[PDB]
Amino acid sequence: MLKIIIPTTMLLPMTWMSKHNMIWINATVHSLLISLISLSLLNQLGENSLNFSLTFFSDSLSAPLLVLTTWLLPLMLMASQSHLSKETTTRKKLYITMLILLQLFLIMTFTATELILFYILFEATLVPTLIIITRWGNQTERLNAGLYFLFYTLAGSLPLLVALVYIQNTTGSLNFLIIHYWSHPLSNSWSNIFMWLACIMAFMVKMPLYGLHLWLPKAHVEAPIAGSMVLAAVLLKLGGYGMMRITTILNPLTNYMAYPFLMLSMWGMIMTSSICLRQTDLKSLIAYSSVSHMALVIVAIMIQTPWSFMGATALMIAHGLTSSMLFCLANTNYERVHSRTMILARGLQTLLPLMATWWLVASLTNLALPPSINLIGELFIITASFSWSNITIILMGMNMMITALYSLYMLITTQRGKYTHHINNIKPSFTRENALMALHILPLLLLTLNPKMILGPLY
């Protein structure tokens, strides 16, 4: 695994020893090459895992997340090139350093054979994101947003640490392989109930769970474009990955303890999809859509059936790509209009036709149009839920209908109708933005050809 970690570390001295006007080119080229190298982790086994060493191991759940993490950095650099133009070389190098450190921590987090090492890196990712949000955000609310994004996380994560060390004091190890092979049932006890809660709540808060989702709209709205991209694409999936790893020690207590979270997610997906219908801000609408999709992923993980896990993996990958694309489109509009109010700039199809095509395809993938991987994950989760209980179909279908409604509402409001007359600074789309949009969308339509790459270890 060092053949990916070491180049990502070398990205830092290369960035800091670069010319003042070569940082973006060098960073983009070498991050793309690192993505290409990481692409060879996809050759997974039907047996246990790719156990590289005592410290790092790869799995067909970890490999798609690793590849998406490596692929996201070049897109983040391309998106950040525009709004950082008027800023000094040292500060741009610091921004690229924060992005590189975030990638390094995420890469080490997804392999992380140890649960304490996983926790340490899973919490180390917090610092670069907070600095990016509270340093290079625009509005005055960013500081407040950062505070939320901080404390919520720690409010969930501090009990987990205690639980973790407690387990190693009883089991003797926190290695995931030993934990899986030596797993034992949890008796229905108050102590075991609180151990279950301490294990679950940390990952629940970062999905986020419906009741615990307040930090996400603030953090995603006030963050710069690279921050929003990394928050929606990779950082939300840490909770799902952690739950998928940790639910192996929580059986059979998950059967009883899953009910409040299942109800919260099943009702909150409807609530947040309905919230999307009445939203005056593009970024907030995209954030609430992310909350709905992650609610579906929470349901899938809580059901803990093979089809549930496959659907959850597919949906995590598809949502990451789609939400990053949607945020990039919103930012392309914002850098022209500087308002971030959906109703202000209207009828952009007549002025930006190719960008309108990008908007249409992004809305189509968000709408879960078959045979996209978005719908593959959606349908697998829905079928698993139907087997779990036939009444889930009402909530699932209502969520599908509202999702289509708000996706097409977002498309029609911004692209169709009549152009706003007083806005005359809508310049033609740059090659950088179109390239960014294509680099988001072609991986999705190309992954629909080989779904088993993103269906997880239970395929």
Binding site: L54, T55, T113, E114, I116, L117, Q168, L174
Partner: protein
């Protein structure tokens, strides 16, 4: 025929020829508790290192 002792004589430490036996346990002490095992051996490196969390050394 008594001669008075000189200066520094009555303060001398002298020896006594006595046939009384020497008390073997004048303090009436109990038996002293057994000492700790005092283990000994030849040092070897710690098995699998420190074994602290995720550290392999």
């Amino acid at each position: 025929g008594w001669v008075r002792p000189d200066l520094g004589e009555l303060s001398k430490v002298t020896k006594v020829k006595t046939d009384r036996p020497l008390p073997e346990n004048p303090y009436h002490s109990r038996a002293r508790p057994e000492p700790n095992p005092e283990a000994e051996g030849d040092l070897k490196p710690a098995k699998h290192g420190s074994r602290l969390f995720f550290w392999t050394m």
